[PDB]
Design a protein around this ligand. Structure first.
Ligand SMILES: O=P(O)(O)O[C@@H]1[C@H](O)[C@H](OP(=O)(O)O)[C@@H](O)[C@H](O)[C@H]1O
Ligand SMILES: O=P(O)(O)O[C@@H]1[C@H](O)[C@H](OP(=O)(O)O)[C@@H](O)[C@H](O)[C@H]1O
Ligand SMILES: [Zn+2]
Ligand SMILES: [Zn+2]
Ligand SMILES: [Zn+2]
Ligand SMILES: [Zn+2]
Lengths: 123, 123
């Protein structure tokens, strides 16, 4: 009589704690999936950055004969299509791929830079 | 009686399943806490690289008026203690803290750089 009246309580209360726990689990799962996806994107991004920073440090003024085409548009050099350098990356380009001058740490007066390095300086 | 027997079981099984679920809840929390900690850590890392990167992509030839001391030894500039620039970072140094020349992407010939940037460009 009162025996089953209390067992139902224990049971009903249990089948209820379960439903709650299960919900908490689907919850933490999604949040885990969410944060896991982000920490992985950070791992890739950190390797991407360290690598680019490294490549930016090796930068050196290129030797003319080593570059036969504009490092930006691929145009070939000749007597009519002369060489120019970017004071930022040290690469060689035609005049149309280095028509802009910018303020760099190498000179007080703006110097020649390629389009890529120009936009990097944020201006 | 068979009714009382069944109920007890229903309940025991319920208790069994709850235990499993509670451990799982704590497992997912442990993992979510570790990942959430790893996220903030790697995030600060990439930010620091962004900072160092943006900090370089904003360096210009420092104005002499805005630098009253060698960016390296604090040595103050005078009529005799002249100002000099490092072509890699654009900062100002005394002749003693910028007595070295190195190869940069800004010129074909070695240019004046501070001790830092020299050894920075691996000597
Ligand atoms: O006059 P030229 O014979 O074209 O010589 C070129 C110029 O001196 C370019 O200077 P610039 O970058 O200031 O144009 C330089 O970057 C090239 O390496 C040289 O081949
Ligand atoms: O000649 P001075 O009167 O000292 O003028 C300084 C020199 O021209 C320095 O050239 P340098 O770095 O190539 O020596 C330059 O870095 C400073 O900005 C100038 O104020
Ligand atoms: Zn070109
Ligand atoms: Zn460039
Ligand atoms: Zn320097
Ligand atoms: Zn000094």
């Amino acid at each position: 009589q009162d025996e089953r009246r209390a067992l139902l309580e224990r049971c009903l209360k249990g089948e209820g704690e379960i439903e709650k726990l299960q919900t908490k689990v689907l919850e933490l799962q999604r949040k885990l999936d969410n944060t896991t996806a982000a920490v992985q994107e950070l791992g890739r991004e950190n390797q991407s950055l360290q690598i680019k920073h490294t490549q930016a440090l090796n930068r050196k003024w290129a030797e003319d004969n080593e570059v036969q085409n504009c490092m930006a548009c691929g145009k070939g050099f000749s007597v009519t299509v002369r060489r120019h350098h970017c004071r930022q990356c040290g690469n060689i380009f035609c005049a149309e791929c280095s028509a802009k001058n910018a303020l760099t740490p190498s000179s007080k007066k703006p110097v020649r830079v390629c389009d890529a390095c120009f936009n990097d300086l944020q201006g």
